Amino acid sequence: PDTLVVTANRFEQPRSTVLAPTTVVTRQDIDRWQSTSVNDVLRRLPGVDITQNGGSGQLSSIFIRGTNASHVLVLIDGVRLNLAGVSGSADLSQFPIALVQRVEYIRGPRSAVYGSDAIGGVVNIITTRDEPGTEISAGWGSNSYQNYDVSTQQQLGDKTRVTLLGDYAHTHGYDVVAYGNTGTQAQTDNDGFLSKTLYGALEHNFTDAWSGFVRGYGYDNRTNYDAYYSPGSPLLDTRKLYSQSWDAGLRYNGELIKSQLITSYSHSKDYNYDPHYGRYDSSATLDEMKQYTVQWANNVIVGHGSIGAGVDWQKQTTTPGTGYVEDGYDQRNTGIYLTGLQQVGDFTFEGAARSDDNSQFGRHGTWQTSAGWEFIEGYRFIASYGTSYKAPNLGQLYGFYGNPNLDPEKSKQWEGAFEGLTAGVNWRISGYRNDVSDLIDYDDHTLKYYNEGKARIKGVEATANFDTGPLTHTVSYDYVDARNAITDTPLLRRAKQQVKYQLDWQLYDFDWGITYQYLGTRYDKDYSSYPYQTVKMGGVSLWDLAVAYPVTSHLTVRGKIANLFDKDYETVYGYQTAGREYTLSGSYTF
Amino acid sequence: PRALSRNQPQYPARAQALRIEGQVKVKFDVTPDGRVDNVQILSAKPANMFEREVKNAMRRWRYEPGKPGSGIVVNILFKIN
Numbered sequence: 001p002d003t004l005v006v007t008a009n010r011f012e013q014p015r016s017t018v019l020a021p022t023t024v025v026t027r028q029d030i031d032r033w034q035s036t037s038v039n040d041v042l043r044r045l046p047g048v049d050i051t052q053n054g055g056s057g058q059l060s061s062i063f064i065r066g067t068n069a070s071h072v073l074v075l076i077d078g079v080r081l082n083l084a085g086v087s088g089s090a091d092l093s094q095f096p097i098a099l100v101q102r103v104e105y106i107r108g109p110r111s112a113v114y115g116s117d118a119i120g121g122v123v124n125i126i127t128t129r130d131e132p133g134t135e136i137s138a139g140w141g142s143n144s145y146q147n148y149d150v151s152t153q154q155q156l157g158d159k160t161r162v163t164l165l166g167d168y169a170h171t172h173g174y175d176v177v178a179y180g181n182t183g184t185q186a187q188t189d190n191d192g193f194l195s196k197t198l199y200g201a202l203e204h205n206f207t208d209a210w211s212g213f214v215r216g217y218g219y220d221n222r223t224n225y226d227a228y229y230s231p232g233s234p235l236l237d238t239r240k241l242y243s244q245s246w247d248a249g250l251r252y253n254g255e256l257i258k259s260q261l262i263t264s265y266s267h268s269k270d271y272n273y274d275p276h277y278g279r280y281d282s283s284a285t286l287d288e289m290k291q292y293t294v295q296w297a298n299n300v301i302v303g304h305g306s307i308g309a310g311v312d313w314q315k316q317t318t319t320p321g322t323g324y325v326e327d328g329y330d331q332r333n334t335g336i337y338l339t340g341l342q343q344v345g346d347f348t349f350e351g352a353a354r355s356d357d358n359s360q361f362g363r364h365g366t367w368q369t370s371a372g373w374e375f376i377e378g379y380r381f382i383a384s385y386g387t388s389y390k391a392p393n394l395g396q397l398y399g400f401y402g403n404p405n406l407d408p409e410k411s412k413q414w415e416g417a418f419e420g421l422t423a424g425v426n427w428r429i430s431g432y433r434n435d436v437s438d439l440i441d442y443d444d445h446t447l448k449y450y451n452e453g454k455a456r457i458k459g460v461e462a463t464a465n466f467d468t469g470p471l472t473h474t475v476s477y478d479y480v481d482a483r484n485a486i487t488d489t490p491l492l493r494r495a496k497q498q499v500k501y502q503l504d505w506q507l508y509d510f511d512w513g514i515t516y517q518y519l520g521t522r523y524d525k526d527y528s529s530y531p532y533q534t535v536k537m538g539g540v541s542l543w544d545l546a547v548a549y550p551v552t553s554h555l556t557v558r559g560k561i562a563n564l565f566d567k568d569y570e571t572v573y574g575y576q577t578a579g580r581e582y583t584l585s586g587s588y589t590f
Numbered sequence: 591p592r593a594l595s596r597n598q599p600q601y602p603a604r605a606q607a608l609r610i611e612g613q614v615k616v617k618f619d620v621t622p623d624g625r626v627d628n629v630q631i632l633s634a635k636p637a638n639m640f641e642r643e644v645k646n647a648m649r650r651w652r653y654e655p656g657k658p659g660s661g662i663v664v665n666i667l668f669k670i671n
């Protein structure tokens with residue numbers, strides 16, 4: 001027999017979340033799946049429930065393990081994505097898929113190591129890869145979809161690398177309808193999305209241990225949607241989002257110690273306006289944020305694991321009218337954290353604690369722990385507990401919609417999980433509970449935010465992967481019971497059940513993938529008449545089919561059918577979904 | 591059978607974080623067109639750690655067209671320097 005030897009890459013820093021439920025998506029997954037949006041990626045993953053106010057480019061919401069849309073912490077290379085809105089919820093419809101080289105995703109009690117406000121989970125979008133070469137890619141699909149992309153990563157000297165990327169994506173989209181939300185008259189226009197991106201990075205090794213980088217990118221997204229129509233008034237119908245980020249950093253990477261010092265600046269401008277009155281007219285809105293972050297992180301290998309510690313500083317400043325705060329705001333935060341990981345015999349322990357000092361809310365601490373036992377070779381029980389803490393955004397206190405006495409949301413959370421490897425099947429099953437105090441909601445009647453008591457979430461997460469000959473199977477099952485504990489009423493837009501099933505195989509050099517998804521029972525609010533009633537949407541099954549063929553060593557052609565049975569359904573009541581959609585693409589590599 | 595490209599398995603994140611080494615021994619077949627086939631895992635140290643990364647990688651392994659074989663065996667060692 002030949003022996004292959006795999007040596008751990010020292011330039012990889014794995015996180016201390018080895019005990020947490022986590023998923024990584026690589027660029028090989030994304031390429032294969034032929035994803036045109038970040039939502040198409042996250043919807044595949046366990047614990048994740050995505051809704052969307054239409055299709056490409058329209059608002060999407062992410063409910064991790066029954067928690068609210070603002071309870072997911074979204075990071076770009078370890079730093080919070082600019083989020084200026086009063087809702088406090090990330091819209092990942094606007095983040096360009098062409099920048100995504102990896103996704104790192106965690107859920108449950110351990111998530112808040114990345115920031116105390118990750119009540120549900122953390123989504124970390126990594127924009128950097130190590131993949132020398134050039135790729136030119138192009139694609140066309142339903143609803144006049146078109147994409148053109150070039151990216152390259154090249155040696156600029158012997159210890160210096162440069163990465164460049166440009167992407168253009170356009171669709172005409174379809175009519176989202178927005179039933180019950182369009183006031184006096186429906187807008188039967190197709191609601192499209194145009195996204196242009198640019199990215200550059202420069203990395204340099206000063207020695208084998210010491211490296212430096214500087215990076216910059218931005219995108220410009222224009223989205224059409226449908227809105228409240230009153231004759232003789234502005235109809236705010238279109239969104240123009242501009243974003244740019246600039247990062248610089250120094251890393252020490254030794255055998256036992258690793259340290260990074262990173263400085264980040266992001267500037268976002270989010271306009272909603274009526275094209276007929278214009279984008280600077282008094283009728284337009286602008287959410288604009290400048291966010292400055294400095295992180296200093298350190299990790300020391302200690303035995304069978306490590307200890308990590310670091311400090312961070314963030315400042316956010318928003319312009320007048322952002323979050324409907326008349327004059328904008330300034331918010332500053334200083335954080336310190338400690339993490340630990342150690343395998344001792346058949347036991348593994350992991351632990352993190354963080355404290356944050358906020359210019360508005362003062363000082364708050366959170367912490368989490370996991371203890372694991374491998375009680376039979378290959379089989380583990382892992383228990384875990386943590387807290388989390390999320391302060392209202394200053395909009396929810398001080399703007400038009402605000403309530404200056406809003407209290408922070410606090411979460412206690414536990415999980416018990418078994419994992420195993422049994423006859424070629426890697427499986428995991430866990431049950432989890434999340435009690436979130438002082439749950440924040442928006443009141444339609446009074447047009448203000450309030451604390452609405454406590455939420456109680458109980459759930460089950462089950463995963464299995466296994467291979468049957470030429471076929472690879474990736475399966476998850478989620479059950480979530482998310483209720484307001486005071487009224488025992490189910491929280492809205494969360495599916496009670498989901499099933500996700502990926503099936504991959506190659507035959508005759510064609511690489512095929514089938515994606516099945518079951519979206520269970522969901523409640524939503526009907527806005528077409530006041531008082532606003534709750535509707536229940538039934539479960540639905542959706543199918544996608546994708547194929548890839550390497551025409552030559554440099555050229556691959558790909559084709560996709562999304563929603564293969566053209567099933568009608570909605571994740572938000574009133575907002576139409578695409579129906580059956582075709583995509584053809586090509587990638588030429590060198 | 592002779593190997594033409596054997597893409598390297600990734601080091602599992604949990605194993606690198608806990609400073610764990612080990613190995614996996616694999617047995618498989620070699621089709622006429624140089625496809626790798628009928629992959630089984632014969633042994634793995636420690637159990638439930640390195641298997642999935644090996645199986646994934648092996649999808650991409652290509653051999654010489656065309657001399658097939660039956661139980662071709664490869665031992666894969668995972669080391670941290």
Ligand code: CNC
Nearest residue numbers: 053058059061069085086087091225226227272285442492
């Ligand atoms: C209620 C509501 C709604 N909103 Co507002 C309206 N009008 N909204 C509001 C209120 C707050 C809701 C809240 N914080 O709970 C209110 C009045 C503050 C608000 C504000 C805004 N909204 C806005 C818009 C345009 C929209 N809103 C809708 C979501 C339009 C909704 C239409 C609809 N029927 O869904 C809507 C009627 C219902 C939300 C709901 O019931 N969620 C229930 C909940 C369980 O689900 P969820 O997915 O977690 O909802 C979250 C988001 O909707 C978020 N959110 C609400 N609006 C936006 C807008 C954006 C851009 C983002 C990123 C998030 C939000 O708030 C919730 C998080 O708590 C929208 C689809 C309506 C529409 N059809 O025209 C539309 C988005 C169009 C698009 N695809 O980009 C504003 C940009 C209006 C403006 N020009 O200023 C503004 C931006 C807020 C921000 N960036 O955070």
Ligand SMILES: CCCCCCCCCCCC[N+](C)(C)[O-]
Nearest residue numbers: 256298300301302303307308309
């Ligand atoms: C910047 C301070 C970081 C906190 C880490 C505290 C433990 C460090 C102790 C040094 C241990 C020696 N060794 C062998 C593991 O490198």
Ligand SMILES: CCCCCCCC
Nearest residue numbers: 421422423424425631
């Ligand atoms: C459930 C324990 C038996 C599984 C043995 C299969 C060996 C591959």
Ligand SMILES: CCCCCCCC
Nearest residue numbers: 506507510512514545
């Ligand atoms: C191997 C031939 C591919 C056909 C699969 C389509 C099934 C939905």
Ligand SMILES: CCCCCCCC
Nearest residue numbers: 177179180568574575
């Ligand atoms: C929900 C708007 C109703 C109009 C016709 C429905 C066709 C699916």
Ligand SMILES: CCCCCC
Nearest residue numbers: 246247248263264265
């Ligand atoms: C060199 C660009 C980085 C930005 C630092 C605030």
Ligand SMILES: CCCCCC
Nearest residue numbers: 477497499518520539
């Ligand atoms: C396969 C489990 C989903 C069942 C729907 C009630």
Ligand SMILES: [Ca+2]
Nearest residue numbers: 175187188189
């Ligand atoms: Ca429309």
Ligand SMILES: [Ca+2]
Nearest residue numbers: 187189225226
């Ligand atoms: Ca429209």
